[PDB]
Design a protein around this ligand. Structure first.
Ligand SMILES: [Cu+2]
Ligand SMILES: [Cu+2]
Ligand SMILES: [Cu+2]
Ligand SMILES: [Cu+2]
Ligand SMILES: [Cu+2]
Ligand SMILES: [Cu+2]
Ligand SMILES: [Mg+2]
Ligand SMILES: [Mg+2]
Ligand SMILES: [Mg+2]
Ligand SMILES: [Mg+2]
Ligand SMILES: [Mg+2]
Ligand SMILES: [Mg+2]
Ligand SMILES: [Mg+2]
Ligand SMILES: [Mg+2]
Ligand SMILES: [Mg+2]
Lengths: 331, 331, 331
């Protein structure tokens, strides 16, 4: 490998994607990424907080993008101010529990893992220190995604090349914040303090919150996603621990790889697709009409009561052939 | 469009389908449909009632059938005796939140929406007035389905034409009826009165009832579906808010589009398939043996305790080559 | 049929598979299997027990393997020491509610059912005596799987023959053990005694335990599965009543039939796949690296808190090209 080019990448925060090329402009390279683990309390909603544990300070962790056959060398840093051990498990990798058995670092330590991205697809990465710590760290926010694109870019079900203009990485996360008998949420001084109470909620399998980008409303209102009519947007969707059923209100999935692995034929014209807990899927959609759209988990209680809603504001000209109000509300 | 034929359809109640042709006998047409919103209390089971909000007086709303490339003009009526605003969101449509942003009507108003059915598949339609009203109206019963057939009819995974004799539209709906501490259900005078208590149940994500055709037992016993040996039945299955896993006890899915979009290859020989909450899927089965069958959501607690069971009684001759009792129960 | 060969099989306990050949070495045969129903209390975990009802004394029931077009003649025995009626419903069969309407046997009776295995795939079989007994017997442990292999063996998405070295049958089962207010589990003298309390837990749809091979830890530690680098292992996964999302930590699904029916194209390179409640799926993986792997349901709360974890210990040489620790934990 001393013989292959090295590319150092600067990660950007979700839902955005760092700069990259859809068709690799070179032969296999070694992609260098660095992340700092940040433990901090985050506001999930009005009066709801989580003692979170995060990759690079965001939930989800940032999206990494590489090409099939490249190597990935991740420098993971556990700063001394943190309270516990962490590691990383890449579903894109082969061996040593996804890298988790080679990356356990205590506060004050760093580690560098190299793996070959042998399989194309969007994949979850997540913390997995061992035993009960595995689910607890993930539902505390420690998960992201790496997208391994085919070297010749995405292809559809007949082998035709397809291209996107923008990638939006929707990281959906379920959380289990303990509640007082009246339904209000509990607050703690650090992650460990709230562990036993959080387990009791985890045992019910009912999340208190299910959110995109780490908080209710993160991608609504002022944080709405933007696009223009004609844009091909690839929505890469991860859910590290619980199923989701994404749907774009007013749109469709033109090409969808719900299990997220690019050499498999994508399905077309979907209304709603399915992201298995522990995976990332991807859906491409070409916007045809301007206006407000919402992208949701279509259990509408999870979308609206729990937080799994993002908005997309689209600029452009309206096409009355696709839809038209014939008789406006009247009476 | 002033230039295309217009077809006025009379909807029939689920689980049945209005008259139609599998292969369009004409070029694009404008299909005209009308529905009246009916708010009324319905009996979900012995001692369990729902203050329902329905399209055309049924749960699910009626099935609309058209062909890809046709237009759909829906006249939606909110009668003055109703208590709240409603609208319609067609997952089959493009733009304005599926039509929801163009169809909000208060009691005493009507609206007419036209959209082009550009994509083949079975799709959910549902009420979505905005915010918390979206899940609450849907789990109150406001959802149905439109099936957009390819103009040249259904095709299998090799492009072969396939045909059905009968369509049965199974609309599965999850409901969240509030309970007293002893497990008995609460009753209310109107939808609004029971809203806060219903939200508390919705927040648990555990339905009190999961039903086909709007009630426990609707399609069992006297309401059992009928068929004959040799019949090809297309079971179109919607679930607007929560996943389901349909299975025909004693049968199979010969051809199944679980994500419900007809240009995608169907899978064959399934035992159980999966309907994502917020979608409609379809399964074709040719009956080979007479007798009693049941069609269920195969979480058997949801099928039996919650209500997701229908029966099918099939007439015809038994084939001992497919199955035979060799030694009858004895001892 | 008096004219076809008969093969008597000796079933082996899950997760193993009885001896068989991938490509049938003969024309259609009549496969003879026998199972004894055993009602007994089983230890699901430290301080958690289930009054179980089992096929052949195991949970899941044993795997049967035959080829498409063969017949299956199952001798089912309900010994006189048992307390209730039981039967069997094969999702692989056509008619009479999968055989359930021809196999209801009381304690002290036997029955022999013949059916033709007309469709290739892994399929669930389970007890289904009628009404509320259907879910209760299944979540009490009465379910297994039959795998009907194509006569010419498994084929991939291009029709290429694929072969496995070992089949591991992972039977995942959800259970609903009643709890005291403090979270501890209740114990009963027999199945019937605990029925009403179990129903109350079933109604919540939240399993107390979700396990492989009938108990928490059954296939971890001393019961870890074994393999060598280079082995192609087919993981056949059943879940008779509730969804699962299998994932091999450190591995992938090379070829996966998640809906479990072999003539459908398998998907490749999956990280996590999905088993619908009421079905069996299959995933083939070639081990590339030695070490510890875990095979889990990837809702990590279900995997770790509820019991859905197995371990696989793999012997062989490590490949630093696939993964290497560049900088070991240091600081
Ligand atoms: Cu961690
Ligand atoms: Cu994982
Ligand atoms: Cu409404
Ligand atoms: Cu919708
Ligand atoms: Cu039984
Ligand atoms: Cu079944
Ligand atoms: Mg940085
Ligand atoms: Mg409080
Ligand atoms: Mg397109
Ligand atoms: Mg009418
Ligand atoms: Mg009462
Ligand atoms: Mg056929
Ligand atoms: Mg024996
Ligand atoms: Mg106790
Ligand atoms: Mg391979």
């Amino acid at each position: 490998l001393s013989n292959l080019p090295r590319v150092k990448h600067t990660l950007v925060p979700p839902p955005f994607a760092h700069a990259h090329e859809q068709v690799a402009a070179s032969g296999p390279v070694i992609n260098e990424f660095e992340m700092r683990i940040i433990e901090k309390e985050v506001q999930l909603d009005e009066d709801a907080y989580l003692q979170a544990m995060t990759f690079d300070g965001s939930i989800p962790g940032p999206l990494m993008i590489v090409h099939e056959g490249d190597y990935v060398e991740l420098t993971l840093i556990n700063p001394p101010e943190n309270t516990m051990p962490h590691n990383i498990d890449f579903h894109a990798a082969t061996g040593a529990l996804g890298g988790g058995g080679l990356t356990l670092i205590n506060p004050g330590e760093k580690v560098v893992l190299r793996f070959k991205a042998t399989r194309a697809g969007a994949f979850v990465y997540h913390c997995a220190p061992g035993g009960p710590m595995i689910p607890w760290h993930v539902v505390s926010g420690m998960a992201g995604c790496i997208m391994v694109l085919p070297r010749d870019g995405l292809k559809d079900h007949e082998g035709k090349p397809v291209r996107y203009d923008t990638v939006y990485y929707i990281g959906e996360s379920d959380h289990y914040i303990p509640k007082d008998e009246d339904g209000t949420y509990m607050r703690f001084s650090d992650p460990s303090e709230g562990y036993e109470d959080m387990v009791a909620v985890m045992d019910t399998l009912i999340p208190s919150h299910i959110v995109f980008n780490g908080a209710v409303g993160a991608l609504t209102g002022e944080g709405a996603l933007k696009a223009k009519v004609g844009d091909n947007v690839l929505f890469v969707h991860s859910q590290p621990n619980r199923d989701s059923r994404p749907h774009l209100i007013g749109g469709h999935g033109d090409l969808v790889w719900e299990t997220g692995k690019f050499h498999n034929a994508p399905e077309r014209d979907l209304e709603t697709w399915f992201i298995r807990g522990g995976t990332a899927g991807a859906a491409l959609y070409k916007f045809l009409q301007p206006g407000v759209y919402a992208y949701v988990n279509h259990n509408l209680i999870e979308a609206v009561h729990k937080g799994a809603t993002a908005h997309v504001l689209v600029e452009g000209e309206w096409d009355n052939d696709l839809m038209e109000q014939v008789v406006a509300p009247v009476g």
